[PDB]
Design a protein around this ligand. Sequence first.
Ligand SMILES: *Cc1cc2c(cc1C)nc1c(=O)[nH]c(=O)nc-1n2C[C@H](O)[C@H](O)[C@H](O)COP(=O)(O)OP(=O)(O)OC[C@H]1O[C@@H](n2cnc3c(N)ncnc32)[C@H](O)[C@@H]1O
Ligand code: HEM
Ligand SMILES: CC(C)Oc1cccc(NC(=O)c2ccccc2C(=O)O)c1
Ligand code: SF4
Ligand code: F3S
Ligand code: FES
Lengths: 102, 239, 138, 613
Amino acid sequence: SSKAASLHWTGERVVSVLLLGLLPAAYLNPCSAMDYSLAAALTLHGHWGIGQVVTDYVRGDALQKAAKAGLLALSAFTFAGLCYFNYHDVGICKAVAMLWKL
Amino acid sequence: PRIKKFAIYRWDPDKTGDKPHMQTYEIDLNNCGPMVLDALIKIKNEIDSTLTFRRSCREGICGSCAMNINGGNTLACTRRIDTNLDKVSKIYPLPHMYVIKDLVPDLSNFYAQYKSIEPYLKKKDESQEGKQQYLQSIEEREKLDGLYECILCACCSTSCPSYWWNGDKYLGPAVLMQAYRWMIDSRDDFTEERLAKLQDPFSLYRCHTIMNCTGTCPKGLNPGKAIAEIKKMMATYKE
Amino acid sequence: TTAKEEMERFWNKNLGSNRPLSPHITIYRWSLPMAMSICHRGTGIALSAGVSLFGLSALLLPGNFESHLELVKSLCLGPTLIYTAKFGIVFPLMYHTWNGIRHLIWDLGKGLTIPQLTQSGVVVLILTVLSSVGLAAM
Amino acid sequence: STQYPVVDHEFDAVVVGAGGAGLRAAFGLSEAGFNTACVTKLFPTRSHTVAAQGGINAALGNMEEDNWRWHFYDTVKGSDWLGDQDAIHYMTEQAPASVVELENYGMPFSRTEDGKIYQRAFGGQSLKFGKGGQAHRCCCVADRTGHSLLHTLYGRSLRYDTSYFVEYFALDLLMENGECRGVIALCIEDGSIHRIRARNTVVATGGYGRTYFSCTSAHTSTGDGTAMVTRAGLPCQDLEFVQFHPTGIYGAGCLITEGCRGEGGILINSQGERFMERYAPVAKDLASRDVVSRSMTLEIREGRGCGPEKDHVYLQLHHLPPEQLAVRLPGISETAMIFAGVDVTKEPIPVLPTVHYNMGGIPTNYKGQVLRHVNGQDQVVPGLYACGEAACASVHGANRLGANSLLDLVVFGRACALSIAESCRPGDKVPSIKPNAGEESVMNLDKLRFANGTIRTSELRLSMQKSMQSHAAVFRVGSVLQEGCEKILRLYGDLQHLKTFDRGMVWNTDLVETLELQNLMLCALQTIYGAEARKESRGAHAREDFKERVDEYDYSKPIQGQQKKPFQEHWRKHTLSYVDVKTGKVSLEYRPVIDKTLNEADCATVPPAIRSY
Ligand SMILES: *Cc1cc2c(cc1C)nc1c(=O)[nH]c(=O)nc-1n2C[C@H](O)[C@H](O)[C@H](O)COP(=O)(O)OP(=O)(O)OC[C@H]1O[C@@H](n2cnc3c(N)ncnc32)[C@H](O)[C@@H]1O
Ligand code: HEM
Ligand SMILES: CC(C)Oc1cccc(NC(=O)c2ccccc2C(=O)O)c1
Ligand code: SF4
Ligand code: F3S
Ligand code: FES
């Protein structure tokens, strides 16, 4: 009797306290390292969040497995795109800053 | 002569081509008891004896007369009729449940879930049982207060939206609370394997603390609280 | 008859019959905590859709971020109207952030009674407006 | 005919009843390796033992030092010497054993300082054989003993491969030539009729409290097995003996436990005087179920009514500390406010003596075997057992001692299990049922399903209820009993004038409540006729005219040169009632009480004496 289901729940809350910790930390300390950590925690937590909606709502055999596959593709693209934005562009912390004073 | 209007859900499976509809009844409160069930029986006895419903104690300790009164899952023998004659009282069967007839739902799945959690005292050594009472201190007993009272009305589980959408695989708060009840019982030795029984995404983990179960409870119990307490144990238990 | 057997036979008799589903959402009463549950899902989905649309367009749409802003600068926007777009971004974010703590306080076990559910309910609701208006002017 | 699909089932044993006794008999059998089937019209939890509050009696010695034989004396005294002392021996010996079992089963009994089961004072119990003050042996789950009982019995029953027929209304006994072969029952779910045959049949269908207009018992206390036994032509014991619980809400008639009086609660008339100190000097308001309620109902006659109607009495919990009321009695604390609109800690509860328990029922062994009376002699009915409030082993006799029935349930439910297990074997031949078996059980169903009567079912239920409520109250004269008898007799003729409306197979509460009306009437006839016939004041049966306690001897003066009285002259005997179903007449005979115990050396007989608390 493995306990993957329980640990999954713990991860969800550990990334939630991490994400809550990162928003003020991104304000007080905007840097390249913060941009990557904010892209990593942001995409992971969102992935697990939507994952919960799919399991709650989508009733089906090859229906639930398909949506979970499509979500992983969407998240992997989202995280890599954010990483690309951090490396070859301004980066979230210096991007939001520009967007706001406008 | 104070006349009250009752809008009640009606369906006859023994009539062909019949589908869910609403039938209204009129009753004087001077001859009727204070409670909704008193009125339910009154129209059952005097007006229409097709109205088929569950009842027993009329005391609030069976969970027989469990139904959705005015958009709220409570007992009909505990809820008193709104004396306000301007409002029409809407009485419905317990939500998202297969209606057998006229406010009577199929609870057999709900019951089956109660069997799956195994609500009996389990000991590692059942060889010395039946001869001497198990010791339990008043503190160890206090832990069961607010849990053992669950009368299994099933107002609870079927007021949880998550239970409507996941009726088969999600156990529902009523069933879940009792699984907890048997965990903190200082006598029960099987606490770990009872937690290991919930190690899938559906069993307990379709809870998102909606908290619509507690507050509809006709006994003032707090299933939600106990569910969150299960979750804590689920991470803080070793092996 | 086992516990697993009873469920399997439950679904067989009911799905192969003319028994209707008792009205659920059609009739049930509305409560603030449950409305605040729906909103948390609504804001959660909308936010993730924003982040995804931001990350994907960084791969799919040509140009750099500075050129994308000069594209919005040349759109004749007044302070009151740019405040409206600024508000409708923080408004869902702040809701989910504050209510997020309310969910996290719940997971610890604290404040799970009906009074504390409606108390923290209004407190989150007010904190949202104060931080949404308070941020959109920075 | 053939409109109804007949479906025959095959088992080792059938138990009719999912409340307490029924359950303990059901899984008690399956534990012994029996292919057992349980049949119940309610769901197990919804049964009426859930409505129990007070407790479950066992001399565990968990408060003071105790003896189970002191529990024997108090039960046999309370029974007004109409109790069969052999069964009482058996029940009081198994008392601590059966309760320890339940605590091991999972019953979350309230706890003491020592860490043991919580026992409390209750009406009619004593120490040192009634010579050493009040006894504290009522084991309880803090005001919700019955609830917790029924649940932990059911929760434990899932362990065994018992076939439960949930929501099935048992119609009649599948009888063939003296011996029983099982039960024929209606499936409320889809209207079908099922014949369930077995080698044995346990009956635990509970009381028949709904014979009266006002009762503490649930709507589904219709004494169905009592009628089932009655329609087979088998006698029914002590049916006129009906327990009136002293305390119950003036309104709907819900029970406020006697555990209130055991914790320190007092009864108050219009003056403020503790009147239960005037009637019973020694035991006070902790006396018998019959003595207390009769004192209460007499105080109403005297003009000491308490409410705006001058027809009810008071139960005060105001003076007790709130600390105790929260921990010890929270179930009544809520239901007093819920129904009567009364805060327990500030003002007293309006109470009225109303029907509670039915000590009468199906004549039963100490082993649980159902008894027929032929040639003035006891005889065992093959393949038929009964246990609980439903049955009458008369361990309660003429007046049930408080908090004994939940014991009676467990012990005698268990008894039927061991009496089957230790007699026949599992896998033994199931007797072949008739091809026609129970034609008129169906011919009864079809008659009532299409009923085109001139008088409604519901109004006839009230016609029976109010008639019993006035003609057979706490006090009853031969005047009101004779008129009441020929009044109930007419209301049996009206059973072919009743109108039904619902004509559906699936869930016909119109049909089953009418089937309950056929069952309640058979109980009613046997209750009222036995009452007018019995001319004495024994226990709950108190004649205003024949106010004497008529025994074989006059037990006031010592038995010396006193001559014994013949059997058909004294009234210390069991009332056996028969009823011809067509004519609706009750003919009744009598049978001796058991006076001897099981073992005189270990537990000695206590002979009749002056009975007052
Ligand atoms: C009325 C009452 C009694 C009571 C009490 C409180 C109230 C309101 N509190 C008690 C207490 O605190 N301590 C105690 O010792 N006794 C107390 N009592 C008395 C006691 O509870 C009853 O004597 C006892 O509950 C009776 O139990 P029993 O095992 O005899 O069965 P039941 O609980 O009444 O349940 C009835 C079962 O029979 C089945 N049934 C009935 N008719 C049919 C038909 N037609 N077909 C199939 N099944 C039938 C029901 O399904 C039910 O399971
Ligand atoms: C820093 C503030 C945030 C905190 C503290 C936080 C934490 C949480 C918590 C505790 C939940 C509860 C899950 C549940 O049991 O229902 C949740 C739900 C969710 N969150 Fe966040 N989150 C934050 C911001 C975000 C962001 C920025 C996103 C994505 C852009 C997001 C997306 C989601 C989604 C999709 C759900 C699931 C909705 C549901 O099924 O109920 N959240 N979050
Ligand atoms: C009373 C009714 C109208 O109200 C409704 C209607 C539809 C959905 C819901 N609520 C959810 O579906 C929901 C919301 C947030 C988190 C999880 C869930 C869930 O599916 O369990 C409530
Ligand atoms: S916990 Fe409350 S709402 Fe849930 S089944 Fe039990 S009594 Fe009903
Ligand atoms: S209504 Fe719900 S999802 Fe959990 S907190 Fe209650 S069971
Ligand atoms: S009938 Fe028992 S709770 Fe309503």
